[PDB]
Structure 1
Amino acid sequence: GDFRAKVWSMTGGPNCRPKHWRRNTAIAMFGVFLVCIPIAKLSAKLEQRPHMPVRPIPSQIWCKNFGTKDDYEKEH
């Protein structure tokens, strides 16, 4: 309104129209992709697939934990 233009918030307050919002949006998208790379690596490392799939699947490209839990007697 009138006083809200003097109020700082993280989400930007009412009717937020930053002038450089396109470049900022692009920078945010690059940041989310960079953050997603290590998450994807950790997920691929951590995934456990006890059963071979019926047909080839995309996770077989990066995940090497297919058919490893067969000897569950030795689990600890």
Structure 2
Amino acid sequence: GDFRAKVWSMTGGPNCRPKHWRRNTAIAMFGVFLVCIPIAKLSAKLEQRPHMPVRPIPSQIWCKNFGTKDDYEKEH
């Protein structure tokens, strides 16, 4: 409105139209993809698949934890 133009918020406030919002949006997209990198490696290292799938799956490429929990008497 009127005073809201002098109010700072993280979400931008009412009717936020930053001039460079496209270059900002793409910089955000590059950042999130960068953060999605360590998450994927940690997930692939932490995933556990006790059963071999009936058919090959995308995860039989990046994940090496298939059919490893068969000796569950040794779990500790």
Percent identity reads 100
Deviation at 1:65, TM superposition (A): 0.3
Q: Structure 1: 5+ residue runs without aligned partners?
A: none
Q: Deviations over 1:32-61 (max 9, x none)?
A: 000000000000000000000000000000
Deviation at 1:19, TM superposition (A): 0.1
**TM-score, reference length from structure 1:** 1.00
Q: Structure 2: 5+ residue runs without aligned partners?
A: none
**TM-score, reference length from structure 2:** 1.00
Q: Residue 48 of structure 2: SS of its match in structure 1?
A: coil
Query: Would you identify which runs of 4 or more consecutive aligned residues in structure 1 move more than 4 Å?
Result: none
Q: Residue 42 of structure 1: SS of its match in structure 2?
A: helix
Q: Residue 35 of structure 1: SS of its match in structure 2?
A: helix
Q: Residue 17 of structure 2: SS of its match in structure 1?
A: coil
Deviation at 1:23, TM superposition (A): 0.1
Q: Residue 57 of structure 2: SS of its match in structure 1?
A: coil
Supply the RMSD in Å over aligned alpha carbons: 0.2
